Write a protein that binds this DNA or RNA. Structure first.
Ligand SMILES: [Mg+2]
Ligand SMILES: [Mg+2]
Ligand SMILES: [Mg+2]
Ligand SMILES: [Mg+2]
Lengths: 75, 96, 113, 137
RNA sequence: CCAUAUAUAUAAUUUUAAUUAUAUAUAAUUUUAUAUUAUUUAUUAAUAUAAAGAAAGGAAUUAAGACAAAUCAUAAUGAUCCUUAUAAUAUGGGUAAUAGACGUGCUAUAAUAAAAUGAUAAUAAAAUUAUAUAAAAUAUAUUUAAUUAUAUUUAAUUAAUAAUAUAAAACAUUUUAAUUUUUAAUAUAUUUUUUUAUUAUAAUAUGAAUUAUAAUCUGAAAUUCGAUUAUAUGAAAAAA
RNA sequence: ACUUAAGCAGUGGAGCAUGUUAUUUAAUUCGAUAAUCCACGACUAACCUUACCAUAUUUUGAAUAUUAUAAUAAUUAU
């Protein structure tokens, strides 16, 4: 969770298929922490309408998935 | 303060032992609050009333001699008949 | 097929609408799953235990359905089904509370002087 | 100072109860409301057809004591020795039936002893509630 | 009917606040004696003086018209409309987006005014605690302690008993940019926390938005989108 | 005679909070419009609340009654 002593908030994710077949992981779980082992994987994050595709880098670790799928248009 | 810490620690440990209290000088988050937290289940579930109540449906079983007229259902049935008479009835539900 | 929710929940004895039914479902399922959720939270929040057990408990907590969460229970009026301005002393919205107080249905309530 | 020259402020409220456990008090209020509605529903009785009697009764007074509940209510109705009319059967199931009388079921409902007290009013203008319910029809 | 002032009852003054608590009852719409001025002229008002007074405030309580209503969320019944959808469940998002525009409040723009401190603890009321409250103590921020915030642990109380909770302004001392009205070195004094003499000496120590780091609280979950702490930041805000 | 005029006490140019409006949005749930002015309920919107958007997904569903097959009992008699 948020408090660092509580650790990251982990949720179920079909990661093993994406660790072997290189397929993207399509998820609505915007509240899941990006663990260090998520690096290099392709995610498709729901933003309420569509699925933004992103590739996880080391700078994204610690942050959460929904931070890179904007829910609203800027203007 | 002037009294040493070791004596107070021994007192605290021994007193916790007597009154069936757990002693955690380390300050580590054991989480005993969860074990000692009271349960709120039954009161939360009893919000809307006990679900076992005598209903009008049950009356025919309970008192065969007495014939009870529920006026609201009669009104609803008569209204359905009135809409039935004018062809304003609900379309038949699709069969799966 | 027969019922909206996974588990069979008995009907509330009073006024009924969809939101009251959802509230009652979540309330009863919270009753049934409270002990399990509390045990999972204990195993997750107990830093004495190995980190793997804590993470397993957290993941199992995340896996639970919405009708087991404590926060999702919201107090609603038992006479109209409204969810706002509900007085927990009578579990009625301010309007239904007003009418019942005027009619004398609420024990002990009176008009202010 | 005298009970023949004033009405107790307790009698103002339909449900007159005090419980240290406030949740039980709220539960009892809700139960009183629901059982009052059910009692309302049970007041119409037809024999075959063209014999639809409608008993008009005021709101119920739920007297909550420590070891007992009493549901007091007033009602209006309308060779008689040798048979039973519908209203008499209704009252006898309220209290007198041996097997499945209403007060036993209400006792299981409330988890305390229950009794029901119907009182007949021979006129309609001796009670505002009964009078209003009558002129409504 | 409240409030107020009294009387009786009740409490074995350790549920103590008897200065209190809640039942009954009384009391006022104040009563009077004069003087002056007006008066429909006294068996009247305006005042003022004297006397007995605790006596000075308040709410509610009815109908008749007329307008406005669908967050008429102040409802009922009826009319019409959907019935693989305008009904129902789950996941996520949104209701928080910003060129702007106007209301409502909070914080400020300094000295008739802000800050720090003030343990045998300056002084309240009304509330709340079985779907709780959390005392004292220990530990970390952090530093001899104090304060403040979390962490560990639950002492009593389910209550006129214990806790939320040592009320705060008030008052006392000290400091406070603009201010060369200040501080500093020498002397100096019957102003000594101080005086004198010679040299030296537009946004601040107001304001806290915004931004960054790292922690913490609730909850299963704080990214969109919560609150809190510390360490850096330090905007606009002066006149009319 | 409401209300005004006067006297007093304020508040009132900035930041933020919170509303409404406009615009945008997939939705930004709902509120006013016959020319002064006025779309303006919040006793707490992260999920629920929720009423809106997207995607899946349920079809007598929340109740009353009818007519039938299966188990449970009670009796009479399987
Ligand atoms: Mg809630
Ligand atoms: Mg400052
Ligand atoms: Mg939802
Ligand atoms: Mg939501």
């Amino acid at each position: 969770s948020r408090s660092v002593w509580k650790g990251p908030n982990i949720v179920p994710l079909p990661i093993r298929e994406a660790m072997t077949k290189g397929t993207p992981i399509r998820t609505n779980a915007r509240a899941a922490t990006i663990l260090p082992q998520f690096v290099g994987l392709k995610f498709q994050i729901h933003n309420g309408k569509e699925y933004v595709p992103i590739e996880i880098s080391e700078d994204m670790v610690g942050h959460k998935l929904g931070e890179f799928a904007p829910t609203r248009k800027r203007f | 303060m002037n009294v040493p810490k070791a004596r107070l620690l021994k007192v605290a440990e021994l007193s916790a032992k007597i009154f069936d209290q757990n002693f955690n000088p380390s300050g580590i988050r054991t989480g005993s609050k969860i074990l000692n937290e009271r349960l709120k289940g039954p009161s939360v579930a009893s919000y809307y009333g006990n679900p076992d109540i005598l209903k009008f449906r049950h009356l025919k079983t309970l008192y065969p001699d007495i014939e009870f007229v529920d006026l609201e259902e009669q009104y609803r049935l008569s209204m359905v008949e009135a809409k039935k008479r004018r062809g304003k009835g609900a379309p038949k539900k699709m069969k799966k | 097929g027969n019922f909206r929710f996974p588990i069979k929940t008995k009907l509330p004895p009073g006024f009924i609408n969809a939101r009251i039914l959802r509230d009652n479902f979540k309330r009863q399922q919270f009753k049934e799953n409270e002990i399990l959720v509390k045990s999972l939270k204990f195993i997750a929040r107990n830093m004495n235990l190995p980190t793997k057990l804590r993470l397993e408990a957290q993941l199992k907590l995340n896996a639970l359905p919405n009708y087991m969460r404590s926060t999702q229970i919201k107090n609603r009026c038992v006479d109209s089904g409204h969810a706002r301005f509900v007085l927990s002393d009578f579990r009625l919205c301010r309007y239904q509370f007003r009418e019942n107080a005027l009619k004398g249905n609420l024990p002990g309530v009176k008009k202010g002087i | 100072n005298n009970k023949l020259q004033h009405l107790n402020n307790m009698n103002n409220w339909n449900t007159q109860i005090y419980n240290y456990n406030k949740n039980m008090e709220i539960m009892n209020t809700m139960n009183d409301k629901l059982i009052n509605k059910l009692l309302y529903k049970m007041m119409t009785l037809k024999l075959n057809n063209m014999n639809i009697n409608k008993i008009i009764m005021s709101k119920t007074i739920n007297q909550h004591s420590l070891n007992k509940l009493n549901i007091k209510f007033y009602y209006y109705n309308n060779n008689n020795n040798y048979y039973m009319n519908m209203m008499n059967k209704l009252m006898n199931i309220m209290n007198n039936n041996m097997n499945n009388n209403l007060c036993n079921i209400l006792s299981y409902y409330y988890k305390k002893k229950v009794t029901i007290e119907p009182i007949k009013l021979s006129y309609i203008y001796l009670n505002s509630d009964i009078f209003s319910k009558y002129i409504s029809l």
